Amino acid sequence: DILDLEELREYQRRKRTEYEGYLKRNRLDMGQWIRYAQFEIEQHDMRRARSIFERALLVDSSFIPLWIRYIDAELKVKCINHARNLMNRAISTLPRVDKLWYKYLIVEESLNNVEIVRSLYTKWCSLEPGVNAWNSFVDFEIRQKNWNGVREIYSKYVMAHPQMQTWLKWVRFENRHGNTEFTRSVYSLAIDTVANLQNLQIWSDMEVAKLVNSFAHWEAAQQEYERSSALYQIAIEKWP
């Protein structure tokens, strides 16, 4: 084992000559890059350890385990502002990749920075990424109890994914809380938009039947059978 600093200085030269030799022959082999970048973290020289990950990103910046390991290397040494810059370059280079967005979130979740995940989610849901992002963004506000904020999301979420399983998710939100004045307002908005946008042909016959039935069976539980009954006539006439 290493005794003094001069034996350490000769130990570090032998490994760094070795690893830089295999990376000179193989620019590729991302696993070889990380094992030499992990070596420099063990030597407690983070200036070198940042450099190998930066050099490895110049070879293959689309390799996701390389991004996560360099982010985790900045987090394990408590360099939080080095990680914020790094995850910012992660999501600005590869905005499609879901892992890089969830990595930004659960670190700022871990720091209880609720205004930074909210600013992050507003940007991420502006690029129209998919239903996994929005559903984790409506689950974020339920944690924060922001009931007025999560109602603003479903206003935008039905405009990004116009389909009944996003509209019926919003009425499963409102009927979970029992607010009757808010639920039929969503129900009135959902059935008018099918009528307003009839010519676009984006809701199928089986798909509009889920909206009419879930409207009617809710009105049956609200003891107003005459509204349950009349909407069946307008829907059959509106769609014969």
Partner 1 sequence: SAFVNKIFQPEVAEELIVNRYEKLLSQRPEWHAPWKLSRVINGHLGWVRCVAIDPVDNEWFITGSNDTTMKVWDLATGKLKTTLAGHVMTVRDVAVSDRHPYLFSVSEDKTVKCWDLEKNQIIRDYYGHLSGVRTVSIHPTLDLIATAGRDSVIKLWDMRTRIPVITLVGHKGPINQVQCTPVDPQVVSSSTDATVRLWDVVAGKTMKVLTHHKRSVRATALHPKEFSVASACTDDIRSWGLAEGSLLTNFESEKTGIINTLSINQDDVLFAGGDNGVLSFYDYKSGHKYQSLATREMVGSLEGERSVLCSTFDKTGLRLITGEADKSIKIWKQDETATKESEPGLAWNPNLSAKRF
Partner 2 sequence: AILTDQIAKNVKLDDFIPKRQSNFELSVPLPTKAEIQECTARTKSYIQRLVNAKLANSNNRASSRYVAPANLLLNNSHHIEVVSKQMDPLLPRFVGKKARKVVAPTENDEVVPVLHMDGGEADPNEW
Partner 3 sequence: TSHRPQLEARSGAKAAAYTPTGIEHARLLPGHTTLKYRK
Q: Using only C-alpha atoms, what is the Rg of the chain?
A: 27
Binding mask 7-46 for partner 3 (x = CB under 8 A): -------------------xxx------------------
Q: Could you say whether residue 106 binds partner 3 (CB under 8 A)?
A: no
Least separation in angstroms between CB 166 and partner 1: 11
Q: Could you tell which of partner 1, partner 3, partner 2, none binds residue 95, using a CB distance below 5 to 8 A set by kind? A: partner 2
Near partner 1 by CB under 8 A, which window of 9-17, 81-89, 189-197, 209-217? 189-197
State which residue, 95 or 149, has the beta carbon closest to partner 1: 95
Q: Could you say whether residue 123 binds partner 3 (CB under 8 A)?
A: no
Contact 143, 159 (CB under 8 A): no
Among 72, 128, 152, 224, binds partner 1 (CB under 8 A): 128
State which residue, 55 or 210, has the beta carbon closest to partner 2: 55
What are the b/e assignments for 151-173, b being 16+ CB within 10 Å?
A: bebbeebbebeeebebbebbbeb
Among 51, 62, 155, 229, binds partner 2 (CB under 8 A): 62
Q: Could you tell which of partner 1, partner 3, partner 2, none binds residue 199, using a CB distance below 5 to 8 A set by kind? A: partner 1
Q: Which residue has the tokens 């019926």?
A: 168
d(CA 240, CA 226): 21
Least separation in angstroms between CB 72 and partner 1: 26
Q: Could you say whether residue 177 binds partner 3 (CB under 8 A)?
A: no
Among 159, 220, 221, 236, binds partner 1 (CB under 8 A): 159
Q: Could you say whether residue 197 binds partner 1 (CB under 8 A)?
A: yes
Among 196, 213, 222, 229, binds partner 1 (CB under 8 A): 196
Angle between helices 131-144 and 98-110 in degrees, nearest 10: 10
Least separation in angstroms between CB 16 and partner 3: 22
Site residues for partner 2 per CB under 8 A: 58, 62, 88-89, 91-96, 115-116, 118-120, 122-123, 126-130
